[PDB]
Amino acid sequence: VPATRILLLVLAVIIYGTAGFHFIEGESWTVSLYWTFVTIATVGYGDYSPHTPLGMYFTCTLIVLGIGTFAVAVERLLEFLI
Amino acid sequence: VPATRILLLVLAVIIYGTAGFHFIEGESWTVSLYWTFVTIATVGYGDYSPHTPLGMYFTCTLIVLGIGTFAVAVERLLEFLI
Amino acid sequence: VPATRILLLVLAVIIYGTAGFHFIEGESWTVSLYWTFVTIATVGYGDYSPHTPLGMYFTCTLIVLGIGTFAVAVERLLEFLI
Amino acid sequence: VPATRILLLVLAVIIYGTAGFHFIEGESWTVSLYWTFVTIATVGYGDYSPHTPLGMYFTCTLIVLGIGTFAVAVERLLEFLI
Ligand SMILES: [K+]
Ligand SMILES: [K+]
Ligand SMILES: [K+]
Ligand SMILES: [K+]
Structure with missing residues (x-):
């Protein structure tokens, strides 16, 4: 799968996780x-x-939606810096 | 290995882990x-x-029975949504 | 690498880790x-x-000697149960 | 990628992480x-x-720069010990 698509996927996970934790658990955005x-x-x-x-x-x-997506994103990022 | 079989295996791990912790450590089902x-x-x-x-x-x-099973499940799940 | 050799390697890691933490940090063997x-x-x-x-x-x-060894052991174990 | 290059990469990550935490969070070098x-x-x-x-x-x-680098380093180290 194209690296830029994997980027968008992990950004979507990050938005989901951050907004979810903020609204459900009440912690700050940061x-x-x-x-x-x-x-x-x-x-x-x-x-x-x-x-x-x-x-x-x-x-x-x-955990289920994000760990795999993040792992793939990291390995693709590896290919680019390395 | 068929994705649906991997699903059943991780569900079995999840039941094992959840019931074990509940009964041994006394925490709620959730x-x-x-x-x-x-x-x-x-x-x-x-x-x-x-x-x-x-x-x-x-x-x-x-840890021994579950981490590998969950890892395979995540990667199989990757293929389906992606 | 033969599965049984990987087993011995992870057992050696476990002995190293357990004895080290016991003697250095003072916690029980268990x-x-x-x-x-x-x-x-x-x-x-x-x-x-x-x-x-x-x-x-x-x-x-x-961490350096054990995480990799454990990961390979888990994947070999997966081959046998699965 | 040559193993020795991966070694330098993870050493660079380790220096970055250590100096960063020391200066930003104020904990000791060790x-x-x-x-x-x-x-x-x-x-x-x-x-x-x-x-x-x-x-x-x-x-x-x-986390983004280091987890992947460490994972590759561990797997290369495995090849040499094993
Ligand atoms: K942890
Ligand atoms: K923790
Ligand atoms: K982990
Ligand atoms: K962890």
Whole structure:
């Protein structure tokens, strides 16, 4: 799949994750964006995490939709810098 | 391996993880499902984790049986939406 | 690489990780084994982690020697159950 | 890509991550090196993490530039030990 398409896909995941965390868990846009990257990259510091059932469900959806997309995006980015 | 078979395998892992954590560590079904995803996806927030020796042994079994299965499931899911 | 050789390699990693965390960080053998799996699988709950400079150095060595070995072991294990 | 080149690339990531965390978040050089490995390997214990907006932005940059580089480095290292 074209690298630029994979870029748009991961940007869409990032918007989804960030807006979701912001509105569901109430954290700031900046913290939510950070939490989104930390989650889809599978880092998972745990400094931020969902504390509501809706947030937990949402996080599972983000995990399923976002980890693979992020992994593909990283590997494509590798091809370009490297 | 057929995508639908991989689906059944990851659903089986999810049931195993969720019921195990619920019964061993005593967390609610919802928290246990969430913890299962967070674990097999290798996110590992650490907001929930086992606090008993049996829970620790169980978590190691889940890690070994579940991380690979979830990884294959994600990559198969990639192909379908993408 | 033969699957059984990969098994021995990951067992060697597990022994190294467990003994090291036990002796350097002072946690029980059981906690240390659990921490080793949680680390080399890249889950990283953070319920346990090194609190000394030697422990931090050691953990970096385990990360480098163990994450790859564990990942290959998992994928070979997938071939056998699946 | 030649293994030695991948080695230089991951060393550059490690320097970037370590110096960045040290200067932005104020942790010691040793803690910062440890945090860098824990982050780019995707372990993410969360015993250390950024607490400023600049640190969060920086961490996202390190995650994008470093996780892929580390993954390739680990797999090349595997080829040599194994
Ligand atoms: K983690
Ligand atoms: K991970
Ligand atoms: K993790
Ligand atoms: K954590």
